[PDB]
Amino acid sequence: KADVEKGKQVAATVCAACHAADGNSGIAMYPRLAAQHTAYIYHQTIGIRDGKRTHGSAAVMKPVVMNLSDQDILNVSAFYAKQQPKSGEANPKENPELGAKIYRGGLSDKKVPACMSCHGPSGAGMPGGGSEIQAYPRLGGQHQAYIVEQMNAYKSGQRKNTIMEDIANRMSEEDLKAVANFIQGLR
């Protein structure tokens, strides 16, 4: 029922300036959206438009999406969810070996579970549907700076999610910077 063609024009005329027309943003401030899951894109946009998601730089996006209809946001969500994801590159000096170990096997000493167990072996996440009561957003190729910022919001409680708040608070700045670096290069 969602109209991907209309979603295309919305992304082209509204979102592209920050997130790119395919969702593969080139500015580390604007998170990637290509192949992010439909319900996740939809609810995050609505939250930013409606003043519920306030942390970080959400304030620059809210005015631009203020007069988008709910159907408009659903259409551009379905559009972005079908795009092909591009990845950044892992910085060899940002301990990508530790990042990979956090991602694939967690940090058992600090009860940090492997990110991959929810976010997938390529960081594709999991969409909602079926009898699944819990979906997981895509992370692969996401800008490392954005990842660290969200992880900090979860740490401080500026962003709410009991699962991620508990995970982020068990980790160190070094842990976050490493796993973020690895995630940027996940293709």
**Class of residue 20 by CB neighbours under 10 A (exposed 0-12, middle 13-18, buried 19+):** buried
Task: Give DSSP secondary structure letters for 67-135.
Answer: T--HHHHHHHHHHHHTSPP------TTS-HHHHHHHHHH-BGGGTB--THHHH-TTS--B--BTTBS--
Q: Is 146 annotated as a binding residue?
A: yes
* Identity of the residue, 44 or 95, whose beta carbon is nearer to ligand HEC in the bound complex: 44
56 near ligand HEC, judged by CB under 6 A: yes
118 near ligand HEC, judged by CB under 6 A: yes
Three state DSSP letters for 42-60: HHHHHHHHCCCCCCCCHHH
31 near ligand HEC, judged by CB under 6 A: yes
* Identity of the residue, 4 or 58, whose beta carbon is nearer to ligand HEC in the bound complex: 58
What tokens appear for 24 in the block?
């593969």
* Cα(174)–Cα(65) distance, integer angstroms: 35
* Identity of the residue, 76 or 89, whose beta carbon is nearer to ligand HEC in the bound complex: 76
119 near ligand HEC, judged by CB under 6 A: yes
12 near ligand HEC, judged by CB under 6 A: no
Beta bridge partner(s), residue 126: 136
* Identity of the residue, 4 or 64, whose beta carbon is nearer to ligand HEC in the bound complex: 64
- For residue 127, the one-letter residue type is P
Q: Is 80 annotated as a binding residue?
A: no
20 near ligand HEC, judged by CB under 6 A: no
List of residues contacting ligand HEC (CB under 6 A): 10, 14-15, 17-19, 29-31, 33, 41, 44-45, 55-58, 60-61, 64-65, 68, 76, 102, 112-113, 115, 117-119, 134, 136-137, 139, 147, 149-151, 161, 163-164, 167, 179
